[PDB]
Design a protein around this ligand. Sequence first.
Ligand SMILES: *[C@@H]1O[C@H](CO[C@H]2O[C@@H](C)[C@@H](O)[C@@H](O)[C@@H]2O)[C@@H](O[C@@H]2O[C@H](CO)[C@@H](O)[C@H](O[C@@H]3O[C@H](CO)[C@@H](O)[C@H](O)[C@@H]3O)[C@H]2NC(C)=O)[C@H](O)[C@H]1NC(C)=O
Ligand SMILES: *[C@@H]1O[C@H](CO)[C@@H](O[C@@H]2O[C@H](CO)[C@@H](O[C@@H]3O[C@H](CO)[C@@H](O)[C@H](O)[C@@H]3O)[C@H](O)[C@H]2NC(C)=O)[C@H](O)[C@H]1NC(C)=O
Ligand SMILES: *[C@@H]1O[C@H](CO)[C@@H](O[C@@H]2O[C@H](CO)[C@@H](O)[C@H](O)[C@H]2NC(C)=O)[C@H](O)[C@H]1NC(C)=O
Ligand SMILES: *[C@@H]1O[C@H](CO)[C@@H](O)[C@H](O)[C@H]1NC(C)=O
Ligand SMILES: *[C@@H]1O[C@H](CO)[C@@H](O)[C@H](O)[C@H]1NC(C)=O
Length: 497
Amino acid sequence: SKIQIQRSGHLNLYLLLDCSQSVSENDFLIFKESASLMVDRIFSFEINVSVAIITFASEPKVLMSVLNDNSRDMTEVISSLENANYKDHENGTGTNTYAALNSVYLMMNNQMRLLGMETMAWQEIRHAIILLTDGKSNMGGSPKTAVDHIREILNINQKRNDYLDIYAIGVGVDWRELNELGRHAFILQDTKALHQVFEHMLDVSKLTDTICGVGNMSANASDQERTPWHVTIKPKSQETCRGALISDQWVLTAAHCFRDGNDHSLWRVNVGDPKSQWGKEFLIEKAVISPGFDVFAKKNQGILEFYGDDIALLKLAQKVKMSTHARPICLPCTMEANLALRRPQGSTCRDHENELLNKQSVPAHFVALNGSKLNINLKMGVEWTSCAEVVSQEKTMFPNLTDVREVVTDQFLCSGTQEDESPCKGESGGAVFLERRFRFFQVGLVSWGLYNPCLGSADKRAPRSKVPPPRDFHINLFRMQPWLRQHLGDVLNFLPL
Ligand SMILES: *[C@@H]1O[C@H](CO[C@H]2O[C@@H](C)[C@@H](O)[C@@H](O)[C@@H]2O)[C@@H](O[C@@H]2O[C@H](CO)[C@@H](O)[C@H](O[C@@H]3O[C@H](CO)[C@@H](O)[C@H](O)[C@@H]3O)[C@H]2NC(C)=O)[C@H](O)[C@H]1NC(C)=O
Ligand SMILES: *[C@@H]1O[C@H](CO)[C@@H](O[C@@H]2O[C@H](CO)[C@@H](O[C@@H]3O[C@H](CO)[C@@H](O)[C@H](O)[C@@H]3O)[C@H](O)[C@H]2NC(C)=O)[C@H](O)[C@H]1NC(C)=O
Ligand SMILES: *[C@@H]1O[C@H](CO)[C@@H](O[C@@H]2O[C@H](CO)[C@@H](O)[C@H](O)[C@H]2NC(C)=O)[C@H](O)[C@H]1NC(C)=O
Ligand SMILES: *[C@@H]1O[C@H](CO)[C@@H](O)[C@H](O)[C@H]1NC(C)=O
Ligand SMILES: *[C@@H]1O[C@H](CO)[C@@H](O)[C@H](O)[C@H]1NC(C)=O
C-alpha cells in the first residue's frame, strides 16, 4: 500500500492514460487534469522523482520517458502532458493494457542498461505505475504477463514490496477488473475527488526531514495534519495563544501573549503528535521577545493599546520530531522557502514578497481555535489604506486619534473586509499563511483587530454588520526581516535582503 515519499533513493512515476473508444474525449480531458495534479503533487515534496507520460489504446505512446533527463523537470513533464491529444489514438481504438504495461517494462529494461544492473543507481529506484482507465481490456493478451515481468526485473519480495506499486483509477468502469491490474483500484467522479484520493496514495511517515510548508491536502485527514506547523501556547496567564513552528525547535508567535513577565519556565508549547490525541507538550529553553514591543508605549498620546513590534521567538527545550503532525512552515526570504517556490538561486527577499503578495487583494488563511482553516483577504497597495483607515472609527481603543498611521503602520498586513473571518484573541499569535503549488508560506502573524467574534462570549463566533466595523491587522514578516535574521541565522539560511 501507498507510494513512499522520502529523501532516500529515487521514485519513478509512470502515468498511463486510457484513450480507447470506451473513454470519451471529455473523459480523457479529465484524465489530463488528474495527471497534471499528480505530477504537481509529487514534485512538491522536494524528492528525487522521474515522471513517464504514456497514452495507450491499441498501442502505447510514450510522450515522456524516465530515460530522458526532462522526466526530472516539472515544467517539461507537464508540457508533454498538455500537448497530449485524444485523436492520436483514432487509428487504433481498442484497449491493450498489456502492451501499455509492457511499455513500462521496456522502459525499465532500458534504464537498467543505462545505469547498470548491479548499481545502487538502479536498485534504489522505487516504481509506481498509475493507470487512468476503466478497464475493459480487449487485445494484447493478459495484463498479468506484463505485471509478472515487471516483478521479475525488479525482484519483488515480501521484503521488497516497497519497490513496486500499481494503481488503476477510474474517473468519469469495471470494478473487479481494476483490482486485477492493481485496494489499489479506485472509481472516482471529480478531479477534486482524485486530488483527495491521491493524498491517501502517498506515504510520508518516513520523511523525518526538516522540510517546510508540507501538509495534507485532503479532508478525512486531521486538522493537525493539514496545518502541522500550528502550535498552542500557554503563558503564565491561562490566556491561550497560537504560534507556528519555523524549524525543529523554534516557534514564531505574538509578543502580546506574554503580558505577565518574561519568565518562560512557566510557559508551555503544544505541538501535534502522531500518537497522542492532545499532542506533545514542550517546555521552553529561552525566549526572544522583540525589544520594541510595548502596549502602553503610546499611552500618553491617548492610545491605550499599541502593537508595534508584536513578535516573539521561543526556543523549545527539546527538538520536535518531524512527522505527519508536526512540521515547520516555510518562512519567506529563506533558501528553504526558495526551493519550495521552485525559484532560481539568485532570489532576494524582495523577489519573494512580490511573488507571494502579488495582488492588491490576496487570499490568505489563519487557523481557528476550532483547528480548522479560515479564509481572509490581505489588502495591499492602494487597497491597504482604505482597509487601514477604518481604524479611525474605534474610540474605545483610540480616543484622541487623528493620525491613523500612529496605530497602523506598513509593519502590519490588513484583512477583515467583506466576508473575511476575524481572528479571536485566543487565535492571536497564529500564522497568516498562503498556499502556493501545494506548499505553505507564513506571510504574517495575527496581532490585533477591531472586533472579536468570540467576545460574545459565553462559550460562538458572531460578526454583526452595524458595528463600525470589524478589521484585522497582522505583523508583516517581510517588514520584520532584520530581527528574524538576528536570531534565526543559525536556524535558517536567509537570502539577500
Ligand atoms: C490515421 O490515419 C490518417 C489517414 O491516413 C490514412 O490514409 C489512407 C489513404 C491510407 O493510406 C491509410 O493507410 C492511412 O492510415 C492520418 O491522417 C493523415 O492522412 C493524410 C492523407 O492520407 C496524410 O496526408 C497525412 O500525412 C501528412 O499530411 C500532411 C498534411 O497534408 C502532409 O503535408 C504530409 O506530407 C503528410 O502526407 C496523415 N497524417 C497527418 C500528419 O495529418 C493520421 O495521421 C493517422 N493517425 C495517427 C495514428 O496519427
Ligand atoms: C494524509 O493523511 C492521511 C491520514 O489521514 C494519510 O494516510 C495514512 O497513512 C498512514 C501512514 O502509512 C497510515 O497509517 C498506518 O500505516 C502503516 C503502514 O505501515 C500501517 O501499518 C498502519 O496500520 C496504519 O495504517 C494510515 O492508514 C493512512 N490513513 C488512511 C485512512 O489512508 C496520508 O498518507 C496523508 N497524505 C499525505 C500526502 O501526507
Ligand atoms: C469550526 O469553526 C468554524 C467557524 O466558526 C465553523 O464553520 C462554520 O460552521 C457553521 C455550521 O456549519 C456554518 O454555519 C458556517 O458557515 C461555518 N463558517 C465558515 C464560513 O467557515 C466550523 O463548523 C467549526 N467546526 C466544528 C464542527 O467544530
Ligand atoms: C537526488 O539528486 C541529488 C543531486 O541532484 C543526488 O546527489 C542524490 O543521489 C538524489 N537523492 C537525494 C534526494 O539525495
Ligand atoms: C475521505 O472522505 C471522502 C469523501 O467523503 C470519502 O469518499 C473517503 O472514503 C475518505 N477517505 C478516502 C479517500 O478513502
